[PDB]
Amino acid sequence: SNAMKVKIYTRNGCPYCVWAKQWFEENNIAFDETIIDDYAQRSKFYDEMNQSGKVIFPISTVPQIFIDDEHIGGFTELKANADKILNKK
DSSP states (O other): OOSOOEEEEEOTTOHHHHHHHHHHHHTTOOOEEEEOOOHHHHHHHHHHHHHHTOOSSOOOSSOEEEETTEEEESHHHHHHTHHHHHTTO
16 A cells, blocks of 8 residues: 555575565565475576566576565665665655
């Protein structure tokens, strides 16, 4: 509504996903997580996404974060934009 549309793509056994997730969690920001376990499947996804132009740099890992349909990026991108974002609530 007045909330942020947060979309996060993840996989298992990735520390950086967990770390990302919990930044939202401890900041009380609800998000839609999509997990993609299979390597092969993630690969197909990077390919699709990269060709779509929804993304501001070519992705080849997770996490990937989108807020309000803007590619943010990975955790290091998140931490970089931590303020822009928190001042969006």
